[PDB]
Amino acid sequence: QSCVWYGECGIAYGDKRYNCEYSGPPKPLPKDGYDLVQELCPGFFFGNVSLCCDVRQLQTLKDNLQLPLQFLSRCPSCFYNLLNLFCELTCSPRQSQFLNVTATEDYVDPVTNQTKTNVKELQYYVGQSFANAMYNACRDVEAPSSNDKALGLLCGKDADACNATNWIEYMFNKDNGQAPFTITPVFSDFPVHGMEPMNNATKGCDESVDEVTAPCSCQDCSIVCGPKPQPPPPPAPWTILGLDAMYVIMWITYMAFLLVFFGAFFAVWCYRKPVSAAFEGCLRRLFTRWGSFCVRNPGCVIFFSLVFITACSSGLVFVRVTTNPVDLWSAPSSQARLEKEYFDQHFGPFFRTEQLIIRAPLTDKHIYQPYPSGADVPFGPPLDIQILHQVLDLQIAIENITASYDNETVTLQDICLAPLSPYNTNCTILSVLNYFQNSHSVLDHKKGDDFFVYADYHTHFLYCVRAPASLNDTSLLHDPCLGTFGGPVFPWLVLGGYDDQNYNNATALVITFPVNNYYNDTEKLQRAQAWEKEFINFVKNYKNPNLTISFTAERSIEDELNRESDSDVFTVVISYAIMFLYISLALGHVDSKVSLGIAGILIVLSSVACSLGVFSYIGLPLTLIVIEVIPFLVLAVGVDNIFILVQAYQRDERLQGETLDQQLGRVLGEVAPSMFLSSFSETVAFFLGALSVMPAVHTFSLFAGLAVFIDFLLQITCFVSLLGLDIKRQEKNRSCLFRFFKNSYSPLLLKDWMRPIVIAIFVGVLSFSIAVLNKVDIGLDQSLSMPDDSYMVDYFKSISQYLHAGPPVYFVLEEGHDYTSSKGQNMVCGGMGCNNDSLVQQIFNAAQLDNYTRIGFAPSSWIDDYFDWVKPQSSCCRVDNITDQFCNASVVDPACVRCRPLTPEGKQRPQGGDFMRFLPMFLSDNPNPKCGKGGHAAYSSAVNILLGHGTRVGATYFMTYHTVLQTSADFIDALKKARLIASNVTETMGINGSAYRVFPYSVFYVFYEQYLTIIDDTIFNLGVSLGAIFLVTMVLLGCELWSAVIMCATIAMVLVNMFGVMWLWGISLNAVSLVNLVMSCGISVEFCSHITRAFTVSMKGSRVERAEEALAHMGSSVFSGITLTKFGGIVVLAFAKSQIFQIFYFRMYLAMVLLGATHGLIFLPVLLSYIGPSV
């Protein structure tokens, strides 16, 4: 056997040369084009080659394969068979078996006068199962900038009826203009004329060609791609018989309660036919004696108390204020905080983002019609050419801003981040104008002639939203849309308002300005914030009636909070003014107590300032929010104690010749145990609520506890002396409620029929509260912490309404992994031979779910890219022969050799020291137009290399994006499921011990890690505070366990009803809701204590009469003392300016006050009447 048509001497036209005829033996290859044999069909290299082939023939094949390579190279198993059909067809060693030249003519040589016979025509025998396996396996390849089949672009006609036999005929036909001579294919599967066609092994778009080349994608093949994944949605509601299954357990219980209760009443109604006294007695004596002492030594007492106030409150000179949200809302040692500490150290902190959500309301969508052919494509309003010009103008102007600072200018070019610098230094700007490179000329330049435009910016947009990483349009335009900074711009980051793939339909435009964030550096942060201030002002004052901008900045939340935290002290001052007005006129009724009310307010403010100052000395910084919510609470408690004491005296009648000290000592000894119990129960409650892990609640709790305690002490002391002085005064000229409570309310409430109704109603409300308890929301909106008139609220609305991607995620593989071994790479890979449970594959599956696991996009790993780069076929890597230095992809090719040898052993992955030998050059590679993307603009940051000792790799991350996250529920779900993925990877890696582990890092993790344990945090906090209250009460009130248990049960009822009100007004259970509940459990005592003690210490006959006696006596002071004061306070606060107050403090306080009032003054009377301790 032998080949024909050897060499290429003839010429058809242009460069087309008819191959020369030569029917001799197959020519041993010259050892010269060994590389070509490894590129065209490596199936020939088993050296004795004896190939009929010629290198000018190999290179003219390669020249013809440019467009087929461009289309079918997407799926290697396809372009592989196509090659099998051409290499064998041209210079296979048994060419004569399946070939027969027909037409040949002399070719005169202008060099030798020697006639060389050209091959004008011949037939090529192709199997039918071969043409069938080829077309059917390549028929699915889609084209770029379209959703057609690449055969639609390679048949020469519509892709709907290009059969498999005709297309090969057209490919071999010179009628297209590419084939140098037309070949008539014969598709016979059996040897005819003694001529048997070629039938080599064949591979479809599903099977892979080599142990390193992944199969074709289901984008370009329909058979490879199967059933989608699906998670099971568990609601986990019990729903016993149709309803919440908690609505029924309670309704069922309540009916049982009402029957077992009225079935005992209506059942009896027919039946008509040293251990305690020793500690409670020394306190009375001590307090009487001390009150007498303070009443007869007023000068010394008041002077020492003022000296104490100043000595303690002068530490307010060292006051520091914390405004950085991380320190406020993040525990200094939480798991997420430690992960953020680890990420900022090895990869540098996450950058600062300044978004811009532009929208064009004044415009309608328009249609784009392709000239040659194609369905109509509608474009959203903002993708209009005029709107694009105006947005480009806005962006180019946003780049000017300089915002001088510290006597020096600070330009964006200076503060923004440029990944690949100092080679390219423009910087990262993520706008849809980067597809055109921010150029009016590039945006307007058209490539058509009158009556039609060939290409347009519509065409460019459509091509690169499909392929945003190209370096040229390569389709009648030949322009890249990679971006001025170098690196792709993903269409989901620069657009919004479209529908699930149709970036044509985008209704909004997103524009991001990434800025470097610095780790332990303040001049740079000051510089960035100084630029951001001017950016904000500019964007705020830009008019442009054609656009509706929703903007933000990294420093905008902090600015918003410093503006709301100073806009309500103007609120707190009116509150104290109304408190003083009420206190001055109501404290007894020149029967006016204005002088005494002023003294009480000054003692209270003194207590506030003193608390703040002592803790400033200790070093706890102020949150300025506390400094605003603390005064209200302290005023409430102080006014209650003052009124109790002053009124028991006012209501006290003097024995025989008593001057002043004896009466005051007697009144204080009989009133102090109660005031002391209330003050201590609240101090302990508050201090104990200062145990959670949140610096804002921690410090607030501490501050408020100390202020209340110090205020109690200072009041009881300076104020009892000053009360003695003022009582002496006025006795030289220098009740209507009590009648009611005893006269018409106490008797009514305690009748024998009204009591069962009241108890039933209150137990019913408690049952309701227990039923709807577990339906309380969890978390904070993050949009309600802002005023109403702010632009951040609008920005959050715009996000929720338009954006499609969320915050980026980094799956940080900690330091300690190998990376220099087959298995060490398989654990990390998302590739050919490495495992199916690897990190990248697991993140890929998670992204495939995208609703269950809130991870939206593929990992975009660096090791997969590195391997693609190092593969010899790619050829991007190329070293100098003598220097072992990185030869760029654009080089004269003087002496640079390929990095990996092009052999079967070199095809494998670089497992040994070549990995770490070539990795740095990759990470230093730039985006070369001939090579590709390079590994500098995307992975230089993502890979850490330790110098020396073999240059072992450090910590690396694989960053993907979250899905649009709109609510606290969304954020907590994202955190949880990211943790799940990380734990799976950590498990699968099978680490010896816990030397290292994978963990995900996102910006909001520190702010949302508290809601993964907030429920157990609430349980612990509430239980501990209530047990502390219980113990303090059962100790201080004597030793009666019955009174203490009744009071504790009433406060627990109050808390449960607090949770009911939470559910009912839409308050969430965050660390603020939790602080207020743990506080309320401490304020309830202030109500529940007076009534129960007035009941306990009484020696009348029946339970009803004891109840009415306690009600009259103490409740006349309790309704006027605590209720009205706290009510005036809350009604002034109802008009807030910061949202969080007006929602949580106002609602929580109104609920607490009115709930405690009702419980105390009604349910305590009746419950004691029924089951109170006898004596």
Ligand SMILES: *[C@@H]1O[C@H](CO)[C@@H](O[C@@H]2O[C@H](CO)[C@@H](O)[C@H](O[C@H]3O[C@H](CO)[C@@H](O)[C@H](O)[C@@H]3O)[C@H]2NC(C)=O)[C@H](O)[C@H]1NC(C)=O
């Ligand atoms: C989201 O974008 C897609 C396309 O990117 C929109 O699909 C197109 O819908 C518009 C609506 O008018 C059609 O103009 C267009 O269909 C055109 O071409 C067909 C081809 O025969 C023609 O018969 C029609 O008359 C029309 O000219 C749609 N494109 C196709 C065929 O896919 C989709 O509607 C967008 N979503 C929204 C909210 O509009």
Ligand SMILES: *[C@@H]1O[C@H](CO)[C@@H](O[C@@H]2O[C@H](CO)[C@@H](O[C@@H]3O[C@H](CO)[C@@H](O)[C@H](O)[C@@H]3O)[C@H](O)[C@H]2NC(C)=O)[C@H](O)[C@H]1NC(C)=O
């Ligand atoms: C992932 O996100 C959500 C899953 O919660 C899915 O949302 C897609 O589109 C909108 C979202 O607002 C919803 O639309 C659906 O439209 C059809 C129209 O016929 C309607 O019959 C459905 O009842 C539903 O309203 C829907 O949440 C969702 N659509 C579908 C078909 O799921 C999204 O689809 C999810 N991704 C995948 C791949 O399912």
Ligand SMILES: *[C@@H]1O[C@H](CO)[C@@H](O[C@H]2O[C@H](CO)[C@@H](O)[C@H](O)[C@H]2NC(C)=O)[C@H](O)[C@H]1NC(C)=O
């Ligand atoms: C077509 O099939 C033939 C089968 O002989 C291939 O020829 C080689 O087959 C093996 C590699 O595929 C070699 O190990 C054999 O040495 C060699 N067989 C012969 C001719 O003796 C041929 O390579 C196939 N086509 C391609 C893709 O090269």
Ligand SMILES: *[C@@H]1O[C@H](CO)[C@@H](O[C@H]2O[C@H](CO)[C@@H](O)[C@H](O)[C@H]2NC(C)=O)[C@H](O)[C@H]1NC(C)=O
């Ligand atoms: C971004 O980098 C490009 C080069 O990569 C810089 O060069 C540009 O300079 C002018 C912009 O002011 C344009 O007129 C040039 O066309 C453009 N270079 C090329 C190749 O055309 C440019 O200065 C950088 N920034 C901007 C804003 O373009």
Ligand SMILES: CC(C)CCC[C@@H](C)[C@H]1CC[C@H]2[C@@H]3CC=C4C[C@@H](O)CC[C@]4(C)[C@H]3CC[C@]12C
């Ligand atoms: C417009 C489309 C159809 C063109 C793509 C098909 C082209 C690239 C195919 C069809 C026929 C093929 C040619 C058939 C014959 C020869 C002669 C041989 O000694 C070198 C390869 C060469 C030159 C082939 C190059 C690739 C080729 C030209």
Ligand SMILES: CC(C)CCC[C@@H](C)[C@H]1CC[C@H]2[C@@H]3CC=C4C[C@@H](O)CC[C@]4(C)[C@H]3CC[C@]12C
């Ligand atoms: C209110 C009492 C307990 C004092 C505490 C005041 C401060 C610490 C509270 C009040 C409002 C709160 C903010 C509410 C909203 C947000 C936006 C969110 O994306 C980050 C947390 C952050 C920033 C919270 C941090 C904590 C916060 C600032």
Ligand SMILES: *[C@@H]1O[C@H](CO)[C@@H](O)[C@H](O)[C@H]1NC(C)=O
């Ligand atoms: C090739 O693939 C096509 C795709 O539909 C299929 O119809 C055809 O049967 C396949 N060829 C076979 C099975 O021989």
Ligand SMILES: *[C@@H]1O[C@H](CO)[C@@H](O)[C@H](O)[C@H]1NC(C)=O
């Ligand atoms: C703003 O930018 C324009 C264009 O880059 C430039 O001409 C001008 O000097 C810059 N500064 C201005 C306008 O103050």
Ligand SMILES: *[C@@H]1O[C@H](CO)[C@@H](O)[C@H](O)[C@H]1NC(C)=O
């Ligand atoms: C910067 O400071 C120097 C010295 O204080 C001063 O002379 C100079 O004017 C300042 N820069 C500008 C722009 O004014």
Ligand SMILES: *[C@@H]1O[C@H](CO)[C@@H](O)[C@H](O)[C@H]1NC(C)=O
């Ligand atoms: C895109 O198109 C050209 C072909 O004209 C290609 O060679 C190159 O990769 C890109 N253009 C340039 C000028 O490099």
Ligand SMILES: *[C@@H]1O[C@H](CO)[C@@H](O)[C@H](O)[C@H]1NC(C)=O
């Ligand atoms: C809006 O766009 C038009 C486009 O012609 C322009 O003339 C106008 O100045 C822009 N701003 C407006 C109308 O406020």
Ligand SMILES: *[C@@H]1O[C@H](CO)[C@@H](O)[C@H](O)[C@H]1NC(C)=O
């Ligand atoms: C996954 O793990 C290995 C590698 O593929 C294999 O033993 C197993 O069958 C695979 N199965 C799936 C579903 O990935």
Ligand SMILES: *[C@@H]1O[C@H](CO)[C@@H](O)[C@H](O)[C@H]1NC(C)=O
């Ligand atoms: C490249 O280096 C090899 C290694 O010794 C050497 O044999 C070869 O001659 C060198 N070629 C050139 C062009 O420097």
Ligand SMILES: *[C@@H]1O[C@H](CO)[C@@H](O)[C@H](O)[C@H]1NC(C)=O
């Ligand atoms: C390519 O590498 C050469 C090596 O010296 C360098 O001079 C040139 O600037 C590089 N071009 C790129 C990275 O685009």
Ligand SMILES: *[C@@H]1O[C@H](CO)[C@@H](O)[C@H](O)[C@H]1NC(C)=O
């Ligand atoms: C984590 O892995 C388990 C099996 O080990 C699997 O059941 C679960 O779905 C995985 N979680 C994901 C993929 O979020």
